[PDB]
Amino acid sequence: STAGKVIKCKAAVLWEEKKPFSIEEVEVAPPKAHEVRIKMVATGICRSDDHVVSGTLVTPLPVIAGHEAAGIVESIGEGVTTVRPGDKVIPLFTPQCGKCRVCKHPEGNFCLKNDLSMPRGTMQDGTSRFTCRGKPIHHFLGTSTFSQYTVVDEISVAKIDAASPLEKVCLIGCGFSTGYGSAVKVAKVTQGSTCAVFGLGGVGLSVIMGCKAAGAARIIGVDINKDKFAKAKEVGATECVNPQDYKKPIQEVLTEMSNGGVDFSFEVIGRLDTMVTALSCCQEAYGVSVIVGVPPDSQNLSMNPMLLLSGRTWKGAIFGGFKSKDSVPKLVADFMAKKFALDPLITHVLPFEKINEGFDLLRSGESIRTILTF
């Protein structure tokens, strides 16, 4: 029995930037009021977790990272009403409190209880449930999935179908939903349109899936790693271009290819230059560009606002625009109903102990998603 007791378990601790994860024993406190302790089953390696290592994405260290995952509830704190022990769940890196102005807005999803804007790396109550070698360890986005057990706030967990395959649906916790929603909800890609997708990793492939679902006629993948092209075509790209193959800037290439600019463009990398390029390549009077990638902390881009004055729309979003707790279970149900595919995103499956190897696969260009199994 573990309910009400501290659990000692293995986690991947990041003690400082630019170091391998350290796989070692941590102590996980029991859940307090309105908290949920989860036994992890599978977690994906998202580029954002690597951004924590590289210092691209700032959050308090030391930390237990990981945010794209699925597990089974081990215990619940007082007052919890939306999940029970034994339920399959996905942790929600964007909460859904249901009560703030954003949660009440028809479009909004970036709940004001999030820990992304100004990261504290705690539970909602400002404390941590993790200790390692006697030291407190920070949480990450209210999730912290690189651990056999984590504790999350109730507003940061969704109950999902008891029959779902957790080694696949963990991707609904971040990369799939982000990319798919960026196309279908944020951009609202139209039938017959031309899309350009910058970055052909797990998120960008999920953008392609959304553009195809929305009926785009042309979906142009853009990546500097041509090894990414074959899979991009399998999931719906009609053409792929590598900017390094061209003498001219790729915005000019894409404008030419699309006979004056694309309908929808997506930045799914995290570079300031590609954000401006992606905006520029959409048609100047009616084009829409969506920023998805997370760029280096504290860095500003430079752009000419004439790009907007002509008529372009520029937007960004977190988690594909989906209200997290409402959307995650529906997306799992949609997966179980064969409405989209997750296998094309999964290139590697490793035990959790091989987390560093999984990160090396990402960094080398070789993987899309590695799924770590506990």
Ligand X SMILES: NC(=O)c1ccc[n+]([C@@H]2O[C@H](COP(=O)([O-])OP(=O)(O)OC[C@H]3O[C@@H](n4cnc5c(N)ncnc54)[C@H](O)[C@@H]3O)[C@@H](O)[C@H]2O)c1
* Binding-site residues for NAD(+): 48, 199-204, 223, 228, 292-294, 319, 369
355 binds Zn ion (CB under 5 A): no
With beta carbons less than 8 A apart as the criterion, state whether 158 and 331 touch: no
Catalytic residues: 46, 48, 51, 67, 174
Stretch that binds ligand X, among 73-81, 161-169, 292-300, 337-345 (CB under 6 A): 292-300
316 binds a copy of itself (CB under 8 A): yes
Q: How many CA atoms lie within 13 A of 329 on its CB side?
A: 14
CB atoms within 10 A of CB 5: 11
Distance of alpha carbon 253 from the chain centroid: 29
Strands 35-44 and 69-76, sheet pairing: antiparallel
Q: How many residues does the chain have?
A: 374
If contact means CB under 5 to 8 A according to the sort of partner, which of ligand X, a copy of itself, Zn ion, none does residue 275 touch? a copy of itself
Residue 232 DSSP symbol: H
Token pair, residue 220, equals 């142009």
* Nearer to a copy of itself (CB atom), residue 11 or residue 189: 189
Instruction: Candidates 163, 259, 338, 343: give the one binding a copy of itself (CB under 8 A).
Output: 259
Strands 88-91 and 157-159, sheet pairing: antiparallel
CA distance 206 to 169: 13
CB atoms within 10 A of CB 344: 19
178 binds a copy of itself (CB under 8 A): no
CA distance 33 to 270: 37
* Nearer to ligand X (CB atom), residue 31 or residue 358: 358
223 binds ligand X (CB under 6 A): yes
- Taking the alpha carbons of 251, 254, 259, 265 in that order, is the dihedral positive or negative? negative
Q: What is the DSSP string of 334-355?
A: HHHTTSS-SGGGEEEEEEGGGH
Binding mask 261-300 for a copy of itself (x = CB under 8 A): -----------x--x-------xxxx----xx-xx--xxx
Q: What is the DSSP string of 145-201?
A: -SBSEEEEEGGGEEE--TT--HHHHGGGGTHHHHHHHIIIIII-PPTT-EEEEE--S
CA distance 305 to 289: 14
Stretch that binds a copy of itself, among 4-12, 120-128, 312-320, 363-371 (CB under 8 A): 312-320
Give the annotated binding-site residues for Zn(2+).
46, 48, 67, 97, 100, 103, 111, 174
If contact means CB under 5 to 8 A according to the sort of partner, which of Zn ion, ligand X, a copy of itself, none does residue 97 touch? Zn ion
> Coil, strand, or helix at residue 206?
helix
Give the annotated binding-site residues for an alcohol.
48, 67
Segment 314-353, which members bind ligand X (CB under 6 A)?
A: 318-319
302 binds a copy of itself (CB under 8 A): yes
342 binds Zn ion (CB under 5 A): no
Stretch that binds ligand X, among 23-31, 153-161, 218-226, 278-286 (CB under 6 A): 218-226
Binding mask 37-56 for Zn ion (x = CB under 5 A): ---------x-x--------
105 binds a copy of itself (CB under 8 A): yes
Residues forming contacts to ligand X in the complex (CB under 6 A) are 46-48, 51, 174-175, 178, 198-204, 222-225, 228, 243, 268-271, 274, 292-294, 309, 318-319
Residues forming contacts to a copy of itself in the complex (CB under 8 A) are 101-102, 105, 107-110, 112, 117, 259-260, 272, 275, 283-286, 291-292, 294-295, 298-318, 321
